[PDB]
Amino acid sequence: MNIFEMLRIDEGLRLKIYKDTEGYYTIGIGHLLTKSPSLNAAKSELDKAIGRNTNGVITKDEAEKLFNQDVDAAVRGILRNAKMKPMYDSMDAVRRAAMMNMMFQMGETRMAGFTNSMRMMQQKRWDEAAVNMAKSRWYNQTPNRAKRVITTFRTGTWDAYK
Ligand SMILES: [Cl-]
Asked: What does the record say mutating residue 11 to N does?
């Protein structure tokens, strides 16, 4: 298992533009197009993303290409954050995948809301950090997914995924 397989499981694969749990236009493997409530805006974003005129439908290879870009983007962002970088560098590979999962799904800003949790892990306060992470909008909105990610971060294993 790896970050790719992990997110593929959590994010699923859609080849046509759809509105997510929050109502925002998305496509492929969890690729947020826009927060605009306007579908054509969303189509415009999609064409820009893929580099051709698509009318809301892409191929799986296109989808995977956007996903790799998105995964890269996520790590790049953790590594560029002054506070996250050392946190990530200090983690083992499974736990680093957990963090990548979180970044990818919610973005930098929201991710910063979890700093207390992260310090708690730095300090080997693993269960405490886990219970703490469940106290959040994230968990409240997509509990099964968050539970998997939390378990992953807490244990360093891929148990929640097999
Ligand atoms: Cl893009």
From this structure: Loss of 84% of enzymatic activity
